[PDB]
Amino acid sequence: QLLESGPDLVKPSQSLSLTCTVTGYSITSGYNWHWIRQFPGNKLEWMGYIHYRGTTNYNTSLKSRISITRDSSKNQFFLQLNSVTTEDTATYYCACDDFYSDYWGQGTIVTVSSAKTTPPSVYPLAPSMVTLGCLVKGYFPEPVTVTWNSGSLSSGVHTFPAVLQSDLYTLSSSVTVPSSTWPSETVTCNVAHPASSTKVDKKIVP
């Protein structure tokens, strides 16, 4: 029903713009359509919403900087947050509710920083069951997506939260499979960094 789309990274003093594409229901038929964010630390904050009748209601502490609009013809609504700073870094979700029920998007991560966008370096980690790995380091900003064998290997996988140091992130992911399947068959980590348009497949060889 709803999916957020927008800039991965914004620089301070700029305006942040996001779009929520809604399908399955008309944003003009009912429900209040909100923008909600979660800062690193897991602290939630409702930013405001646009009523299905075209009306608005913002969070008082963001009133002067926010603007929520919509395009009824395309069935999508938008968030605009002016003069952002490093505080505004958060995962942004769009959602709708009628008090009795609510629906949420998947959320999109937005980083407000003046740091340099950098592609990641992907290094293979080779050594009944064997554990393999994938080290994704030297990138900015978050997020990166990591899958194994295009996603066919899901259980036995552990992707760890990236760690920031000197404006660069480092992340790792382990996959545990039967010794029968490796090195016999191939295991490959798929890494994506949308912000730098990077996509890498690193086969794990012995």
């Binding site: 602290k43 409702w46 609510d102 980690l125 760890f160 939260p161 790792s172």
Partner: protein
């Protein structure tokens, strides 16, 4: 800006246990909402207008309260209830949320499976050298790691990361990455990853020689 203090900040329970968490406001609020959020997914309303259950939410859940003291209760805990619960008030704008209560599910202890990995060739070619260690599927969540190079402990250049409780087996995992320059790496031979956990008095060790 009104403040919701949620208690306890963290708690665990075996499936079957009764669970209670509180939401105490710094000012009078006429009602609250409760949201459940599991690792990796978006928040979801679990209780609305303090005592009310949205459709699809299990009846083992109930909420009650007034004035400045609210609470959420689970009559009989199930493994699938593990998540972080947030309370929210909407009596005043801004409709402030609480910092949350992270409900974890307990299980039998489990020692960690430890794996160490030397730097790859591609990285060495870049003048960099990272040694990675994984401590996976352990429990409880308390654990330590120590890096030793040729016998002596190494503390600088270590980045650690911890996952949230696994949704299938309720274990925790950890990743420790030691990064050195290529030349510092080649000045030594033995690289050790040492893990100390409740399930064993002596630390588990894995290692490799350059």
């Amino acid at each position: 800006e009104l403040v919701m203090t949620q208690t306890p900040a963290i708690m665990s329970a075996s499936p079957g246990e009764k669970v209670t968490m509180t939401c105490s406001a710094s000012s009078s609020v006429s009602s609250v909402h409760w949201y459940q959020q599991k690792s990796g997914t978006s928040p979801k309303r679990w209780i609305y207008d303090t005592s009310k259950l949205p459709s699809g939410v299990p009846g083992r859940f109930s909420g009650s309260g007034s004035g400045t003291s609210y609470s959420l209760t689970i009559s009989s805990m199930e493994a699938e209830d593990a998540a972080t619960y947030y309370c929210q008030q909407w009596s005043s704008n801004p409709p402030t949320f609480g910092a949350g209560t992270k409900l974890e599910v307990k299980r039998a202890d489990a020692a960690p499976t430890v794996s160490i990995f030397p730097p790859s060739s591609e990285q060495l070619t870049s003048g960099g050298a990272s040694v990675v260690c994984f401590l996976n599927n352990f429990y409880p969540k308390d654990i330590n790691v120590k890096w030793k190079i040729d016998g002596s402990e190494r503390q600088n250049g270590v980045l650690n990361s911890w996952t949230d409780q696994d949704s299938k087996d309720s274990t925790y995992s950890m990743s420790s990455t030691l990064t050195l320059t290529k030349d510092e790496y080649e000045r030594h031979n033995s690289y050790t990853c040492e893990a100390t956990h409740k399930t064993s008095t002596s630390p588990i060790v894995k290692s490799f020689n350059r």
